[PDB]
Amino acid sequence: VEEVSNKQIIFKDYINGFPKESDMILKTSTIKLKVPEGCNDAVLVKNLYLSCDPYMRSRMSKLDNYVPIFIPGSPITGDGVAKVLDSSHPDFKRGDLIRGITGWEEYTLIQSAEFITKIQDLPLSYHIGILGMPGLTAYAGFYEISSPKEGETVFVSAASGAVGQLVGQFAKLSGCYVVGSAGTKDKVDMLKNKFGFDDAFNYKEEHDLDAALKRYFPEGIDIYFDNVGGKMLDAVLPNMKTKGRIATCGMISQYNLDEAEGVRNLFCIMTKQIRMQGYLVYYYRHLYPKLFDLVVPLLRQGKINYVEDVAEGLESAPAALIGLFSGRNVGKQVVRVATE
Ligand SMILES: NC(=O)c1ccc[n+]([C@@H]2O[C@H](COP(=O)([O-])OP(=O)(O)OC[C@H]3O[C@@H](n4cnc5c(N)ncnc54)[C@H](OP(=O)(O)O)[C@@H]3O)[C@@H](O)[C@H]2O)c1
Secondary structure: OOOOEEEEEEEOOOOOOOOOOOEEEEEEEEOOOOOOOOOOOEEEEEEEEEEEEEHHHHHOOOOOOOOOOOOOOOOOEEEEEEEEEEEEOOOOOOOEEEEEHHHHHEEEEOOOOOOEEEEEOOOOHHHHHOOOHHHHHHHHHHHHHOOOOOOOOOEEOOOOOOHHHHHHHHHHHHEEEEEEEEEEEEEEEEHHOOOOOOOEEEHHHHHHHHHHHHHHHHOEEEEEEEOOOHHHHHHHHHHHEEEEEEEEOOOHOOOOOOOOOOOOOOOHHHHOEEEEEEHHHHHHEEEHHHHHHHHHHHHHOOOOOEEEEEEHHHHHHHHHHHHHHHOOOOEEEEEEEOOO
């Protein structure tokens, strides 16, 4: 039984405002590469990829919190891809590749097993992106929540991100006219060139968001896929069509504010008869087969594209997570901990 070093990213303590790299601490611990005797229904894994996700910011402040907080002194946890080294669980065996909740470290003794699934060709990292939680988020928000119909107009914010880039391609599959906003020229070019968006604009260079939306949506928006909230959401509301739908997926412009911004155009919910509906992807896990059945053939034919941002090494993970809130990532942010 080899006992080896185990680098970990430890959560320091609760924060306010924007997260900093000193809120996460590199610690070198030790681990024996065997499931402990008397420790049952557990899986010991070597972590291969880690996902960086905006919701992780909310785990860094103590609040009624919608996701359980990080524990100070303990490793950051989140979605990852890992290889089973040893198992006391009947459904996992040495060599299996899994996806699910694991530790921000080289090796994790996963004690529940509820939060992991065995990986069924495509890049391993896809299982925490288009074939994982962000892909399921895009599928549930667009197809289940938004009720898209052929010919409808669709606006997507954070459109080059892990979720948004898929929403735009689903909208094209549905025969919709789709526009996205993103924060750099490169992201805007990628929206039109690889994600098949009909148009796109850099919201950071638009001094009048209402005017920008009217450029692209002269007769209004049928479906707004909201990833950002805040001023963008407020500009969208008067530009919705009657009976338009807003899929409230996230509001990343708010996650680092002590006081959330006021949204002032909600009267448009009445005047435009809008259905604004939020959702949490965990309540849609039963749709994973429907996601796979749709996107796996398209990926194989190269008819749907997925762009990832791969940070190299566990030590790069804190900066990769902080970069989400400045738009440093181009596509789905992942961390490569080890090859395998
Ligand atoms: N409901 C659910 O269950 C669920 C599940 C997963 C994700 N979500 C939400 O979905 C949204 C997108 O997630 P993702 O994983 O795809 O992240 P992502 O788009 O891959 O990365 C985050 C992006 O947010 C944009 N951003 C950051 N700060 C911003 C600001 N102040 N204003 C506008 N845009 C900003 C940046 O893109 P730009 O360069 O374009 O600014 C950045 O690249 C997030 O709000 C997340 O919380 C919800």
